[PDB]
Amino acid sequence: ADNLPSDFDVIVIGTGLPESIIAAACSRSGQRVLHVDSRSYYGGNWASFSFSGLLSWLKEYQENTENSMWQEQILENEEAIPLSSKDKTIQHVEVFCYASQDKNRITYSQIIKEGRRFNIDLVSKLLYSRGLLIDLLIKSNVSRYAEFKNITRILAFREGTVEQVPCSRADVFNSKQLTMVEKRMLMKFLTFCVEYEEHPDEYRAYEGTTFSEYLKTQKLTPNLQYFVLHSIAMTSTSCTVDGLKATKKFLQCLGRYGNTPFLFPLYGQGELPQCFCRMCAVFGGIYCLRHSVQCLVVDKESRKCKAVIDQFGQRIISKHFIIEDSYLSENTCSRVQYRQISRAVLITDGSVLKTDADQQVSILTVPAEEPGSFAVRVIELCSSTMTCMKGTYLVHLTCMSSKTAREDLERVVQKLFTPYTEIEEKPRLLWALYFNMRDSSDISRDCYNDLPSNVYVCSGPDSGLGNDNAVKQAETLFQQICPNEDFPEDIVLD
Amino acid sequence: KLKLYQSATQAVFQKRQAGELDESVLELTSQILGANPDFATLWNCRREVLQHLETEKSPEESAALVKAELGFLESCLRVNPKSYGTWHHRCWLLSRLPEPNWARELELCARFLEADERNFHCWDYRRFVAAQAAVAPAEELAFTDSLITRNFSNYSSWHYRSCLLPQLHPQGRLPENVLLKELELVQNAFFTDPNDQSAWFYHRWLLGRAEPVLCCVHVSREEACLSVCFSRPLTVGSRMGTLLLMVDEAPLSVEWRTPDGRNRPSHVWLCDLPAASLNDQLPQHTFRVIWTGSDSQKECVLLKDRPECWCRDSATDEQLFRCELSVEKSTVLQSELESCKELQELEPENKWCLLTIILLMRALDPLLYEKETLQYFSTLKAVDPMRAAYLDDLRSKFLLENSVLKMEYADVRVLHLAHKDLTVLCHLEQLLLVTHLDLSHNRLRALPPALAALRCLEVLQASDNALENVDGVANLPRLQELLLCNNRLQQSAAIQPLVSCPRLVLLNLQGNSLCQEEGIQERLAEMLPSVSSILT
Amino acid sequence: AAAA
Amino acid sequence: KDVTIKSDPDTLLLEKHADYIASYGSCMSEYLRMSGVYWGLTVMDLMGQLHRMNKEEILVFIKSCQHECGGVSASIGHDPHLLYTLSAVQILTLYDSIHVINVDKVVAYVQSLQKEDGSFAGDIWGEIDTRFSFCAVATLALLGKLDAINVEKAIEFVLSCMNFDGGFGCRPGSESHAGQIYCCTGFLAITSQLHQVNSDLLGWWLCERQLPSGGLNGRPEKLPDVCYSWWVLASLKIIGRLHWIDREKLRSFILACQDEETGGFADRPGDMVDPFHTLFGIAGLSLLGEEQIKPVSPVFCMPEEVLQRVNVQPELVS
Numbered sequence A: 001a002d003n004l005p006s007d008f009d010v011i012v013i014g015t016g017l018p019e020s021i022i023a024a025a026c027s028r029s030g031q032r033v034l035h036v037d038s039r040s041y042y043g044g045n046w047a048s049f050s051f052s053g054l055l056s057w058l059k060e061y062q063e064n065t066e067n068s069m070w071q072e073q074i075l076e077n078e079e080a081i082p083l084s085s086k087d088k089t090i091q092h093v094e095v096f097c098y099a100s101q102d103k104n105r106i107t108y109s110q111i112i113k114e115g116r117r118f119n120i121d122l123v124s125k126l127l128y129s130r131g132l133l134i135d136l137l138i139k140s141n142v143s144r145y146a147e148f149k150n151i152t153r154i155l156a157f158r159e160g161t162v163e164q165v166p167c168s169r170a171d172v173f174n175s176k177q178l179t180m181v182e183k184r185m186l187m188k189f190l191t192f193c194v195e196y197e198e199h200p201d202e203y204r205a206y207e208g209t210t211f212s213e214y215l216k217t218q219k220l221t222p223n224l225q226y227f228v229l230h231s232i233a234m235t236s237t238s239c240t241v242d243g244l245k246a247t248k249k250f251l252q253c254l255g256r257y258g259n260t261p262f263l264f265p266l267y268g269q270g271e272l273p274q275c276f277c278r279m280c281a282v283f284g285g286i287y288c289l290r291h292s293v294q295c296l297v298v299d300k301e302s303r304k305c306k307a308v309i310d311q312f313g314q315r316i317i318s319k320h321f322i323i324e325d326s327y328l329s330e331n332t333c334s335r336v337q338y339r340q341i342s343r344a345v346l347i348t349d350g351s352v353l354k355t356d357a358d359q360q361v362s363i364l365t366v367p368a369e370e371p372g373s374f375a376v377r378v379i380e381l382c383s384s385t386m387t388c389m390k391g392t393y394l395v396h397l398t399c400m401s402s403k404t405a406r407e408d409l410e411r412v413v414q415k416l417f418t419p420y421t422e423i424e425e426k427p428r429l430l431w432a433l434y435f436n437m438r439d440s441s442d443i444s445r446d447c448y449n450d451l452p453s454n455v456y457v458c459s460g461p462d463s464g465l466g467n468d469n470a471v472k473q474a475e476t477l478f479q480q481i482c483p484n485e486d487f488p489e490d491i492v493l494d
Numbered sequence B: 001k002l003k004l005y006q007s008a009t010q011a012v013f014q015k016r017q018a019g020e021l022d023e024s025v026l027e028l029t030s031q032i033l034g035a036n037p038d039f040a041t042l043w044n045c046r047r048e049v050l051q052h053l054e055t056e057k058s059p060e061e062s063a064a065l066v067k068a069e070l071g072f073l074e075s076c077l078r079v080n081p082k083s084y085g086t087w088h089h090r091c092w093l094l095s096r097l098p099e100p101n102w103a104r105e106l107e108l109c110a111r112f113l114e115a116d117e118r119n120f121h122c123w124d125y126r127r128f129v130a131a132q133a134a135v136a137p138a139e140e141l142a143f144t145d146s147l148i149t150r151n152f153s154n155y156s157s158w159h160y161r162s163c164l165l166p167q168l169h170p171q172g173r174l175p176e177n178v179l180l181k182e183l184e185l186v187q188n189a190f191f192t193d194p195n196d197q198s199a200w201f202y203h204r205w206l207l208g209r210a211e212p213v214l215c216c217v218h219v220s221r222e223e224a225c226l227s228v229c230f231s232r233p234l235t236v237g238s239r240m241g242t243l244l245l246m247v248d249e250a251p252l253s254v255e256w257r258t259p260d261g262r263n264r265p266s267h268v269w270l271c272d273l274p275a276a277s278l279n280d281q282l283p284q285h286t287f288r289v290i291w292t293g294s295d296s297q298k299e300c301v302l303l304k305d306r307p308e309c310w311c312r313d314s315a316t317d318e319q320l321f322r323c324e325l326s327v328e329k330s331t332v333l334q335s336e337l338e339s340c341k342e343l344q345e346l347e348p349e350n351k352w353c354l355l356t357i358i359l360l361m362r363a364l365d366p367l368l369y370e371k372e373t374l375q376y377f378s379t380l381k382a383v384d385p386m387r388a389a390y391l392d393d394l395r396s397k398f399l400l401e402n403s404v405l406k407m408e409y410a411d412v413r414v415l416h417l418a419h420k421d422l423t424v425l426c427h428l429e430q431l432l433l434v435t436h437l438d439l440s441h442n443r444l445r446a447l448p449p450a451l452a453a454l455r456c457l458e459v460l461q462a463s464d465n466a467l468e469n470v471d472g473v474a475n476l477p478r479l480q481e482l483l484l485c486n487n488r489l490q491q492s493a494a495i496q497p498l499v500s501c502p503r504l505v506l507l508n509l510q511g512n513s514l515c516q517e518e519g520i521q522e523r524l525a526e527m528l529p530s531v532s533s534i535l536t
Numbered sequence C: 001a002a003a004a
Numbered sequence D: 001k002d003v004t005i006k007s008d009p010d011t012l013l014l015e016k017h018a019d020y021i022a023s024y025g026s027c028m029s030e031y032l033r034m035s036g037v038y039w040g041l042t043v044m045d046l047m048g049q050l051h052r053m054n055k056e057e058i059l060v061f062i063k064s065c066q067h068e069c070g071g072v073s074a075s076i077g078h079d080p081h082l083l084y085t086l087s088a089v090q091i092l093t094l095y096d097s098i099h100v101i102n103v104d105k106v107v108a109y110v111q112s113l114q115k116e117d118g119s120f121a122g123d124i125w126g127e128i129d130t131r132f133s134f135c136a137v138a139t140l141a142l143l144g145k146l147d148a149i150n151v152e153k154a155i156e157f158v159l160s161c162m163n164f165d166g167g168f169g170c171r172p173g174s175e176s177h178a179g180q181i182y183c184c185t186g187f188l189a190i191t192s193q194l195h196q197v198n199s200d201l202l203g204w205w206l207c208e209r210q211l212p213s214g215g216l217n218g219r220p221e222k223l224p225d226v227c228y229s230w231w232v233l234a235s236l237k238i239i240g241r242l243h244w245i246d247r248e249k250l251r252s253f254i255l256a257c258q259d260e261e262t263g264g265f266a267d268r269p270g271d272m273v274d275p276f277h278t279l280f281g282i283a284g285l286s287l288l289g290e291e292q293i294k295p296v297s298p299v300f301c302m303p304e305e306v307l308q309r310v311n312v313q314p315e316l317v318s
């Protein structure tokens, strides 16, 4: 790492999902790539953390130096672009420890003791049965480095009660809550959504109204309306043709691997980036964690980045440079408008919908109420997902933020759980974590100030449930870097 | 292009004609057997060679090549699931084998059943394995409840349940308790998916029951005849059993015949009665018929001055057209009905729903839903035109039943059925006591032979119909007036059968083409010299 | 050319 | 809801078919040639064209297949089976050369296949199938030897194969299938047991086989096959419900299934044509009344002529 080659075709800085994918693409493509990261772990803001790993991570965002030595290396006819030297993507880190230390009661020391049985993701996302990422995983066989599990249920919270949403043919049948009549309406309508394109004039008139005002006219009880609106379509304003496109994707994903549209990587979403990084390595990619880059060496004349200088003072030459947003100076991004993602990671002692088969990954959606409020999606993980110890559940909440993560998600959390106490019906909350992550997705490359043409920028996560955004920018980037190039048993299940 | 696959074949014949029950052929068979798994002859030669080591060679080759097959078979089924040959070999193999590996069978089944929920070959094989490994009915009854929830078109699944539920619980199709349940399981099977015939058919079968029987005993004095009607067509004097007659508490040997003397299976049978059983030596006579083979017994008494006597089972009192829903059942069906009208609003063009709405009304109150039932047939006839003929005969059958019920209730023997657009006749064996039958102004294209059960029919008004055949009028003991004006009786030969009606005096035929023949009035008088008046 |  | 869509072949091409079958044999079909000949011969005959087939060669071939046990094999060298035994008796029956084979053995081979339940195994390798309860009774009938077996018991078996929907399956417990209803209604007719069949019920299930295209299928939720036209109609005729089908719609479907070029009929409009379907297409039209095809027997699938001669023809349902 302190004696890297001086020549590379492309240098990737950051190991988030997008950068990793693009890193793999270029390695499989014959390009010599150098992939470095400042963190001492893989994943950037997509990273997974053990409990100890999480505590350290949040600790460095609760605490808060001149070292410009690379300057004597900047040739006369060259210019330099300093990179960021401290990450400023996480904010408003708030923590609560309800467990007894900081019927089979779990204590804080228990979690500490079992800390490696955890794999808390900074990013809360489910894999779609049939999405860009899943295919890519298969087509690249990167999926080989990962096992998956099916989300066994979709849920809805109404009238202060959590219930399961019927969304498959089999579900509707067994359901003993949908009046005989409803089972027909739903089954009928859903069969329509998958083919909403086949009936252009069955909604045409509504191609200019709320997808919720539309569903009001259709042959659906109000009950079934809520379901299609929030639970299936999962759309917050949403255009009529929007809920349809949504529900269509949901329904075309249902069945492929299970009674739901979604999968969840075993051990957490944090594993995905590392999978692509492995392929990258497989094809000659050179890796360096805990290896920061000081600046980009722009050519005074041609105005293109020609190399970089790392912490070891090494000057590394490359043809292309991909840099995750985070590694850019507050200057380079003075013009960039960002968004913020509110996040919550709870550890609980019970499922939101108690059942006999308690080992299951479900997903709930709480519809906003306030104008500027957004839709909060809570994804509950059982210990079998390999992201938390036995006896507990790791519950993730997400949403585009209005205020601080805690102000955005606290209400929902207080409606779904109750803080653990010695005052020994909803699950018990043993440890909550709130924080805001920067959303640098969907930002025009020209918004960054003075970056050469051969320097590309990857974003961090996005509030979207799936990873289509990460795959898209990577393929977009692969277009510009390796023109006219190209990006088989399916996955494995638990 | 093409490969000489026949060569390997001609080889197996040669490598057999002598007695090469070895392996050099057992492999060459898999070659052809792979593409043509229907070449039954091969599955034999193979089934031969290999059984030549299942008692011979070492169990370390046999028990070994044993599994070597169960692997080969799956390989054949993979490429050809449908193939009586393959599946049979497996049944054969898994039959001989000393160790009951059944466990892995019920899984290999669930394997192909999931691939193709509609492969009877597999369900038959499973039925085999289930019977072998003595799988409990209830166990299998669960495998179907699951295959039904996930699948959209599972007829093989419901079919199986129809065989399983009976053998779990032995009026109604199933015990009130099991019945009301099975219904609900089906009520949503088609509400979820109404375009699945399955649910619909099975649902029909759930509204019926089975029949135990001697349903009537009539005795005419003037005819010195005793008539008997059975629930279904059986043959008196043979296996099934025979009829014994007890006149005045004493046996009386009689010969038993059918109206046409051919004595084939029939609802009606009769015998002649001696003078003693009808004279005046007693203030009355007691007749007691006993059908052995079911022992159903009927008995009627003939008073000194009465012309006839009978003992019949009321279709009503026997619930043949209804089912007398028990307070609970009634409610579930009444609820079943209502829910279906809704399904119609959602699915207006679903013929199955409309139809079932009718069957539900027939199950509740046939007479009440008379106006409604008829309206639905109209609807149904429009959405499902191809079954117009079916619907018609069905509407006809129900129309008849309603009428029979009214007659039994009114307690008379006159059966009015004019202006009902009837297209066929049904349950004629219930009519035995009917004296007057009006079937004019309908669309009957024929009087059927089954009409022979009407042993008391005096007048038969069948004018204005499309009658082309009147063969079923033959052998009617009391028929005196036969009106058939305006019909389709073409040739005079179509009247030939009437010479069997010993009491026919009035025969109105005006309106049929046959009257156009020359000398028809003379030809008919020759043919029916006994018929006093023959209007033509 | 048959089957079942 | 899965039916076919007829394009824009509306006329019976007799001669075109006559040529097809007459030119057929001139690959992998051999394992059933006996029945193959039986289909081609029967169809040609129904077209008053039986003279275009080599009776001599066929007769020599039939004899060459009767193995020293009575049974007849699909082809020379292959194994003896009830199916090909029946196919052969038929070939011989319509060729009136029923003296070519040993009738005593054939009748022996047949009874040697009935079990204690009444059923009939296909061959010595015991394959119980109502499909074979038909072949037995039909073979014996065409030989006036229907007494050789335990008719009372064989009937008890066949009747135990009746399902909740009026139809019949392969064996006790099996699913109602069109081809299996034909064999059981054919056997029920031959053995005078039609009074057991529930005409109204089975008749309904049977007409429901007809899809919007006019064609018929073998069971619920399947595509129309010109061959199920025969099997469904024939069963309907036997049980006396043939008027429950839409003669026209079916006539158009069946006619569409014929190759206006090669001749012969195909399973479905547009697919390949073969003798098996050429017979059942012509056969189907015959049952619906066609002034160019001899009346076909809805029980033996042979000219009602040939059967009136051998004086073998069960009375169907009233």
Ligand SMILES: C/C=C(\C)CC/C=C(\C)CCC=C(C)C
Pocket: C002, C003, C004, D086, D087, D131, D179, D180, D183, D300, D301
């Ligand atoms: C391969 C064919 C089937 C599985 C359907 C079963 C029907 C038969 C075997 C009919 C044979 C009878 C004659 C018309 C000769």
Ligand SMILES: [Cl-]
Pocket: A126, A127, A128, A131, A132, A133, A134, A465, A466, A467, A468
């Ligand atoms: Cl995704």
Ligand SMILES: [Zn+2]
Pocket: D225, D226, D227, D228, D267, D277
């Ligand atoms: Zn076919």
